[PDB]
Amino acid sequence: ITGLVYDQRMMLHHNMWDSHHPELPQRISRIFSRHEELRLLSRCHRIPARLATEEELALCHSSKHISIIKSSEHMKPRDLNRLGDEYNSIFISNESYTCALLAAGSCFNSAQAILTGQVRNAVAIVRPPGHHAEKDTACGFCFFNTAALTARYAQSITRESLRVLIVDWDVHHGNGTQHIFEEDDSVLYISLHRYEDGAFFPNSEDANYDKVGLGKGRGYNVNIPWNGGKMGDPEYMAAFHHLVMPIAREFAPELVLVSAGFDAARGDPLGGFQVTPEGYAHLTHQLMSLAAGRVLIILEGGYNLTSISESMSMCTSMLLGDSPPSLDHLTPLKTSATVSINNVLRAHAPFWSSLR
């Protein structure tokens, strides 16, 4: 069984000053509608949304950050505008806090359904996104780090040392997820992201391949940064073959979370990349070979409504057990992708015998 969570209340968060903002309420409704059109919704077990609690938010976030985001829901528009402007790339409305609580709680209910055996795997069609949010601050359309919180929630309902893999295929680096787990060997973070020598959002050298983790976490942070090329299916498939899957298999996760932005998709106006819906299906199907299939796909970014709807629907089709669609596997890689892959191999060979 595959679970699906979607709740139209998460559409209530919006940019009060721009009706054409990329992080649009219709992102989640279009994805949900496409699941109905492709006859996937009726095949899934519907998992209800719920609110995260403040104690659950404190698994990854500071009390001050929780209280400031909570305080926004009382503010008049002028004060919402001021507060949002204090962060990097954030808009806030009076519904934002509630929507962020529902995004996280939806994912907790999904992780619980997987870990208790009610479903094998699941998809969560949620907003606002999470992976840029830090312990102490909001960033990049994200208020609380839904995927990071879900990893800690999973440990909280099992054992502290439950091995959780987070694969982040959003086109942007999940700076918050990296930082939250940087010293932690129980949560392996693997991000693929457009980097451009630190020029691309979120504009930090923390996203480079030589950031391998700290302390006991050394080797448990895998950054795969792309420079120069318009990356697509062959480059992501090659990164999975040489890096993501060998490392993940050696880590032997007990739960896989996907920070599944669809902003690397063909058609995305921000990402500039060309991963196809069939490409995302192949990435999902590979991850399904891990953790006895216990995979939760969590929406992050993605800004072409057609692209994200087709891409995420293809991922759900794979979770349901459908045959992976045909792909032209032979295609030659862009030259800069091979350079990136080799840089990651050089940085991570000391930590992973599967790369030696």
Which positions make up the binding site? 170, 172, 263
Is 13 an interacting residue with respect to ligand HBJ (CB under 6 A)? no
In the complex, minimum distance from the CB of residue 356 to ligand HBJ, in angstroms, rounded to a whole number? 34
Q: How far apart are CA 187 and CA 10, in angstroms?
A: 28
Q: How far apart are CA 119 and CA 121, in angstroms?
A: 6
Is 268 an interacting residue with respect to Zn ion (CB under 5 A)? no
Is 21 an interacting residue with respect to ligand HBJ (CB under 6 A)? yes
Is 220 an interacting residue with respect to K ion (CB under 5 A)? yes
Q: Per-residue string for binding with ligand HBJ, 294-313, x by CB under 6 A? A: ------xx------------
In the complex, minimum distance from the CB of residue 15 to ligand HBJ, in angstroms, rounded to a whole number? 8
Binding-site positions for Zn(2+) read: 170, 172, 263
Q: Per-residue string for binding with Zn ion, 160-179, x by CB under 5 A? A: ----------x-x-------
Is 267 an interacting residue with respect to ligand HBJ (CB under 6 A)? no
**Residues labelled catalytic:** 132
- CB of 111 or CB of 265, closer to ligand HBJ: 265
Binder to Zn ion among 134, 184, 263, 310 (CB under 5 A)?
A: 263
Is 202 an interacting residue with respect to Zn ion (CB under 5 A)? no
Span of 14-22, 113-121, 225-233, 290-298 interacting with ligand HBJ by CB under 6 A: 14-22
Binder to ligand HBJ among 95, 134, 168, 170 (CB under 6 A)?
A: 170
Binder to ligand HBJ among 25, 105, 128, 140 (CB under 6 A)?
A: 140
Q: How many residues bind ligand HBJ (CB under 6 A)?
A: 16
- CB of 44 or CB of 231, closer to K ion: 231
Binder to ligand HBJ among 201, 220, 226, 236 (CB under 6 A)?
A: 201
HEC string of 90-137 equals CCCCCCHHHHHHHHHHHHHHHHHHHHCCCCCEEEEECCCCCCCCCCCC
Identify whether the C-beta of residue 230 lies closer than 8 Å to the C-beta of residue 272.
yes
Binder to ligand HBJ among 6, 87, 141, 226 (CB under 6 A)?
A: 141
Is 129 an interacting residue with respect to ligand HBJ (CB under 6 A)? yes
Is 150 an interacting residue with respect to K ion (CB under 5 A)? no
Q: Which residues lie near K ion (CB under 5 A)?
A: 168, 170, 181, 184, 189, 191, 193, 217, 220-221
